[PDB]
Design an enzyme around this catalytic site. Structure first.
Site, PDB file in Angstrom:
ATOM      1  N   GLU A  77     -22.113  16.379  17.899  1.00  0.00           N
ATOM      2  CA  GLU A  77     -20.950  15.720  18.294  1.00  0.00           C
ATOM      3  C   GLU A  77     -20.657  16.135  19.764  1.00  0.00           C
ATOM      4  O   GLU A  77     -21.425  16.989  20.340  1.00  0.00           O
ATOM      5  CB  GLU A  77     -19.959  16.368  17.355  1.00  0.00           C
ATOM      6  CG  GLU A  77     -19.448  17.819  17.443  1.00  0.00           C
ATOM      7  CD  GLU A  77     -18.281  18.124  16.759  1.00  0.00           C
ATOM      8  OE1 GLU A  77     -17.533  17.100  16.416  1.00  0.00           O
ATOM      9  OE2 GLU A  77     -17.964  19.242  17.010  1.00  0.00           O
ATOM     10  N   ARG A  78     -19.885  15.726  20.405  1.00  0.00           N
ATOM     11  CA  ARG A  78     -19.592  15.782  21.635  1.00  0.00           C
ATOM     12  C   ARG A  78     -19.306  17.376  22.004  1.00  0.00           C
ATOM     13  O   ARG A  78     -18.283  18.080  21.267  1.00  0.00           O
ATOM     14  CB  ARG A  78     -18.178  14.893  22.369  1.00  0.00           C
ATOM     15  CG  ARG A  78     -18.186  13.477  22.184  1.00  0.00           C
ATOM     16  CD  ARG A  78     -17.031  12.742  22.181  1.00  0.00           C
ATOM     17  NE  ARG A  78     -17.017  11.340  21.617  1.00  0.00           N
ATOM     18  CZ  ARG A  78     -17.124  11.102  20.777  1.00  0.00           C
ATOM     19  NH1 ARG A  78     -16.958  12.016  19.510  1.00  0.00           N
ATOM     20  NH2 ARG A  78     -17.021   9.692  20.125  1.00  0.00           N
ATOM     21  N   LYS A 128     -12.062  10.201  12.130  1.00  0.00           N
ATOM     22  CA  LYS A 128     -12.790  11.309  11.394  1.00  0.00           C
ATOM     23  C   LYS A 128     -12.593  12.780  12.058  1.00  0.00           C
ATOM     24  O   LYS A 128     -12.348  13.713  11.150  1.00  0.00           O
ATOM     25  CB  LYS A 128     -14.113  11.104  11.546  1.00  0.00           C
ATOM     26  CG  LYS A 128     -14.637   9.751  10.744  1.00  0.00           C
ATOM     27  CD  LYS A 128     -16.154   9.516  10.725  1.00  0.00           C
ATOM     28  CE  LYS A 128     -16.897   9.676  12.025  1.00  0.00           C
ATOM     29  NZ  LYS A 128     -16.351   8.386  12.919  1.00  0.00           N
TER      30      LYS A 128
END
Ligand SMILES: Nc1ncnc2c1ncn2[C@@H]1O[C@H](COP(=O)(O)OP(=O)(O)OP(=O)(O)O)[C@@H](O)[C@H]1O
Ligand SMILES: Nc1ncnc2c1ncn2[C@@H]1O[C@H](COP(=O)(O)OP(=O)(O)O)[C@@H](O)[C@H]1O
Ligand SMILES: [Mg+2]
Ligand SMILES: [Mg+2]
EC number: 7.1.2.2
Lengths: 53, 469, 47, 498
Positions: free
Chosen positions: B180-181, B154
């Site tokens: 997200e990270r 993704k």
């Protein structure tokens, strides 16, 4: 040899289909148990959340 | 107005007002914090109390702390001055570069466009990716989804799209990283600085970034999507121009909504999700639209928990998207990258009257041959390849060639594969697949088609394979 | 509860790996043969 | 004689000061949760203390009472007791003074050996570093396992995940990583020294004692901290041990040094958090875990950063350990942590019993950093090895032609090459030598049951006769042409001579 081989292949396929049918029966029983258990688990989670407010 | 914290439970703060209450969705500022803690009103509980979700850590809050009522929802800075910057949910900058000096502040909560504003025109957006262009072609102004579990591609695919479309796109662009990270946020910041879309010297930046990464409390993750959406909406309307809007992932919005629902007093729904899942997602996905005043091309990455496409979150998200590209792990194990599933991806414009009869027929032929291959794989598990009808082996060979030919090397996946990125124009993809189906390559080996651009590159790779045979 | 095409390789049990290998070995063999023929054609078409 | 003298030395210095402190009366105590009444100015997640010297955390701030969780046993707290607020968010000691010390979740020495001389305290609940401080992961974190250093490499600042079933060899990988750092910590340069932290959550005290003695035998406590919140420690301690250890590692990464932290397991911190949340009456979620169960871990694993050179340059690697149930990676906490972490290392029982140890499932194991954070020699060799195993795994389910027969032969040779023992990590150059020998068609002549014998004997031979070549490979960090020619002749000679 070809006659005997075709006879043996017919017999082997019949036995394999029978074994697959027994395995299908057992796995269908297991699947039904698991489906009911999953329904009960999700429902109990919902009930516990509702009563824990 | 001034109120007073009366309870703190996790990320949910109950604030009591002696004067008139503040309306729902208003932003309140806690007084006595070194940093800026903003609560957002979510409910009126009666007895002058209002429940709120904190947009920051609620550590060090004291029962009785005074609270100010801003009188308006969270208002973020908007304009051409936000380009090249980074922001929180509450709009303050987190790039350590100084204040964002705009004249316009936009509230992050707004009504969706009405039905009399919808554009009904669709034209293919050529991304340069073979599978996407062939089977699930995108569309300007349409909403794109990228489903798939964890570790399927993704983020790599969305970075690849930013590399292609955004770099050569005249209009502006927005990237809202939702839950997200943070490593990936920094990597994107530096990659964009290197490419040049973010220019730290001049005022020529073409990308505005908003970050709500997964270290933030649920309140901030549930709203950073709205902040990025507000920036994009302003660029759509006032600037009157094309916009791109990338989100990664839009499942963390739902999940963050689910982490506070139980504490707001709502009974849960089907699988530990809030009762308002569909409504909460709709009131957001309905502002990401191409009205007649502007045009937002929205690309969304959607985590699918445990590869389960029937989970309520992705299942609900499916209905809000024009095009979908369901990345599949079963195809990524095979090494076909991007792992887009050709049979589980769809597009609205995929009709013979929008793309053309050649494109449509090639796509449908590819899908049919792949489905026939899937049907045959069951038989090959018992007979074996040696016992198939000499026509079936032809179907299997074509199917494997087509399966490999959909793989492509990205310019952002140089580190993994070590290969070089290829951009394949749409006509070349159509020609390649039409030829592979027509049988003009039923002598080249399968591996010749693996990770190459246009078909001629497959021919050249086969030639090299033969020479060093 | 039903069954669908391409399910043996979706389970990934023993039959799935067995089928994958039965396919891969055969197509490696055919790729080798086709590469040999391609080399022969290359050499025979230089002149 | 002097025993009593040193006893007195303790009394001589006491705490005379008695201050006017805010308090509260314990309305109700039961199951480890107290409901204090009062404490009108107590903060959220502040540390309070009870009349018996027992600590606790004020987790719930309700209008009528404060829900406090007791960091210890609960039988000693009565109703109508007194809770004094200490006016300080929960924090733990930090510093090099902790190295070699076994401490509990709150930073109290647990092995006797006196007290901790820490001069600084750090709050457990600190926000992760922003987006700007970090910098992409550059250096390699040398784990010592061939299959991890070659096929799923780990950098410094990465957050790998070791996920598997019970008794597949996860703690073994953690201990090998800890032990391997001895060679770097003994050396001179400080840019390679890596201080290790081991958080033991829910493990019975016997297991942690075995682990500590194992580290002592390998002389690996010079630089290891062990934060043990064992099974008999109240849930508020097993919930907080990961954060205490992560603060002890945040100190190192914030002071230009490098740290490695190993939460073991996180699936037990999740259970302790669930127990806490259910006993505070917070509504349950899915599988009864609270709603904030992803946050619990995401805020914890996001602190493993890689600071840029402006912020010291220090780093903090993390190796969380998850435990799945019968390989059901699709469970709740496993999926959360898999979507939180960078890489993964899948251990499988089917591989553990088939003889492949460590059971690392190289097919599924991933590492986003990949190329980066790998030495040039390993990058050169492990790439070809990765391609060879990738091809082998396709045609493996069976067991004709020369090409595919040799492909299977090479795959099997490499497979038996990757096996390893316990607590015997290898230097990176030694791994490169072994993998080079295996991948350059040399072992294809040998039987596959004898590959272990080769590996071992070849290592023993090279470590003595050709120490110079290994030093060259380490220092220059690549297989130069002359180094390659040497390696070639050494392997050719040794193979025949064996
Ligand atoms: N590389 C190896 N070679 C031989 N044996 C090994 C190896 N790795 C692990 N083992 C064996 O596996 C057993 C379990 O090891 P370990 O404790 O590392 O797994 P674990 O999953 O952490 O166990 P638990 O989860 O129950 O604590 C040990 O008794 C050890 O003998
Ligand atoms: N185009 C590609 N080519 C090769 N490998 C890829 C590609 N895209 C993703 N990967 C693999 O996937 C990993 C990254 O996955 P990523 O997309 O970041 O995860 P997610 O999609 O779950 O966010 C990399 O380690 C890489 O091995
Ligand atoms: Mg991602
Ligand atoms: Mg263990």
């Amino acid at each position: 040899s070809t006659t005997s081989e075709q006879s043996a292949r017919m017999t082997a396929m019949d036995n394999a289909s029978k074994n697959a049918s027994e395995m299908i029966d057992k796995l269908t029983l297991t699947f039904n148990r698991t489906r009911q258990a999953v329904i009960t688990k999700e429902l109990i989670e919902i009930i516990s959340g509702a009563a824990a407010l | 107005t001034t109120g007073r914290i009366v309870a703190v439970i996790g990320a949910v703060v109950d604030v009591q007002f002696d004067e008139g209450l503040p309306p729902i969705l208003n932003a309140l500022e806690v007084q006595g914090r070194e940093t800026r803690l903003v609560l957002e009103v979510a409910q009126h509980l009666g007895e002058s109390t209002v429940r709120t979700i904190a947009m920051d850590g609620t550590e060090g809050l004291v029962r009785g702390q005074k609270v100010l009522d801003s009188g308006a929802p969270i208002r973020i800075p908007v304009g051409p001055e936000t380009l090249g910057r980074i922001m929180n949910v509450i709009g303050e900058p987190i790039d350590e570069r100084g204040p964002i000096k705009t004249k316009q502040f936009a509230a992050i909560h707004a009504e969706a466009p009405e039905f009399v504003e919808m554009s009904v025109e669709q034209e293919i957006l050529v991304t340069g990716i073979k599978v996407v262009d062939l089977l699930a072609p995108y569309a300007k102004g349409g909403k794109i989804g990228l489903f798939g579990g964890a570790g399927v591609g993704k983020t790599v695919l969305i970075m690849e799209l930013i590399n292609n479309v955004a770099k050569a796109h005249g209009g502006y662009s927005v990237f809202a990283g939702v839950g997200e990270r943070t490593r990936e946020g920094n990597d994107l910041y530096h990659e964009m600085i290197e490419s040049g879309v973010i220019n730290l010297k001049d005022a020529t930046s073409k990308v505005a970034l908003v970050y709500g990464q997964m270290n933030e409390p649920p309140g901030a993750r549930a709203r950073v999507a709205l902040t990025g959406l507000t920036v994009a909406e302003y660029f759509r309307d006032q600037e009157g121009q094309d916009v791109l809007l990338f989100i990664d992932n839009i499942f963390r919005f739902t999940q963050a909504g689910s982490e506070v629902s139980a504490l707001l007093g709502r009974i849960p729904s089907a699988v530990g999700y809030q009762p308002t899942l569909a409504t909460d997602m709709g009131t957001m996905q309905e502002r990401i639209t191409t009205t007649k005043k502007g045009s937002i091309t929205s690309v969304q990455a959607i985590y699918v928990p445990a590869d389960d496409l029937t989970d309520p979150a992705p299942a609900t998200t499916f209905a809000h998207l024009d095009a979908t590209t369901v990345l599949s792990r079963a195809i990524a194990e095979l090494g076909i990258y991007p792992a887009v599933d050709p049979l589980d991806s769809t597009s609205r414009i995929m009709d013979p009257n929008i793309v053309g009869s050649e494109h449509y027929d090639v796509a449908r032929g590819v899908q049919k041959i792949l489905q026939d291959y899937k049907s045959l794989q069951d038989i090959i598990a018992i007979l074996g390849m040696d016992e198939l009808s000499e026509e079936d082996k032809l179907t299997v060979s074509r199917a494997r060639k087509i399966q490999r030919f959909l793989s492509q090397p990205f310019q952002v996946a140089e580190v993994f594969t070590g290969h070089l990125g290829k951009l394949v124009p749409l006509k070349e993809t159509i020609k390649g697949f039409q030829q592979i189906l027509a049988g003009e390559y039923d002598h080249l080996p399968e591996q010749a088609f693996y990770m190459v651009g246009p078909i001629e590159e497959a021919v050249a790779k086969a030639d090299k394979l033969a020479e060093e045979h | 509860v039903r069954s669908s095409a391409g399910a043996v390789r979706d389970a990934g049990g023993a039959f799935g790996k067995r089928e994958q290998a039965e396919e891969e070995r055969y197509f490696r063999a055919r790729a080798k043969e086709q590469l040999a023929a391609l080399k022969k054609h290359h050499e025979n078409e230089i002149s | 004689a002097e025993v009593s003298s040193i006893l007195e030395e303790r009394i001589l210095g006491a705490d005379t000061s008695v201050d006017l402190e805010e308090t509260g009366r314990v309305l109700s105590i039961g199951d480890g949760i107290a409901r204090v009444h009062g404490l009108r100015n107590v903060q959220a997640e502040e540390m309070v203390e009870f009349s018996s010297g027992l600590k606790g955390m004020s987790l719930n701030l309700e209008p009528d009472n404060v829900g406090v969780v007791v960091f210890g046993n609960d039988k000693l707290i009565k109703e109508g007791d007194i809770v004094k607020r200490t006016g300080a968010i929960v924090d733990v000691p930090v510093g090099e003074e902790l190295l070699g010390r076994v401490v509990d979740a709150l930073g109290n020495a647990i092995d006797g050996k006196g007290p901790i001389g820490s001069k600084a305290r750090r709050r457990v609940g600190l926000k992760a570093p922003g987006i700007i401080p970090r910098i992409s992961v550059r250096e390699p974190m040398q784990t010592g396992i061939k299959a991890v250093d070659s096929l799923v490499p780990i950098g410094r600042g990465q957050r790998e995940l070791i996920i598997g079933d019970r008794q597949t060899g996860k703690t073994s990988i953690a201990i090998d990583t800890i032990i391997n750092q001895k060679r770097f910590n003994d050396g001179t340069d400080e840019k390679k020294k890596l201080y290790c932290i081991y958080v033991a959550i829910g493990q019975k005290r016997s297991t942690v004692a075995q682990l500590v003695k194992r580290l002592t035998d390998a002389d690996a406590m010079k630089y290891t901290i062990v934060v043990s919140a064992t099974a008999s420690d109240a849930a508020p301690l097993q919930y907080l041990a990961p954060y205490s250890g992560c603060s002890m590692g945040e100190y190192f990464r914030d002071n230009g040094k490098h740290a490695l932290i190993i939460y073991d397991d996180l699936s037990k911190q999740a259970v302790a958090y669930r127990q806490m949340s259910l006993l505070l009456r917070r509504p349950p979620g899915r599988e009864a875990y609270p709603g904030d169960v992803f946050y619990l871990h995401s805020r914890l694993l996001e602190r493993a950063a890689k600071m840029n050179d402006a912020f010291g340059g220090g780093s903090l690697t993390a190796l969380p350990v998850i435990e799945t149930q019968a390989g059901d990676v699709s469970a709740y906490i496993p999926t959360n942590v898999i979507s939180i972490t960078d890489g993964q290392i899948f251990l499988e029982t089917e591989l553990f019993y088939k003889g492949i140890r460590p059971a690392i499932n190289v097919g599924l194991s991933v590492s986003r950093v990949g190329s980066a954070a790998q030495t040039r020699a390993m990058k050169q060799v492990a790439g070809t090895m990765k391609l060879e195993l990738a091809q082998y795994r396709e045609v493996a389910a069976f067991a004709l032609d020369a090409a595919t027969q040799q492909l299977l032969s090479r795959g099997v040779r490499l497979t038996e090459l990757l096996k390893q023992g316990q607590y015997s990590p290898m230097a990176i150059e030694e791994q490169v030598a072994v993998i080079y020998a295996g991948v350059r068609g040399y072992l294809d002549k040998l039987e596959p049951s004898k590959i272990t014998k080769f590996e071992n004997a070849f290592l023993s031979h090279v470590i003595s006769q050709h120490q110079a070549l290994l030093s060259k490979i380490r220092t220059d960090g690549k297989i130069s042409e002359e180094s390659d020619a040497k390696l070639k002749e050494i392997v050719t000679n040794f193979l025949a001579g064996f």
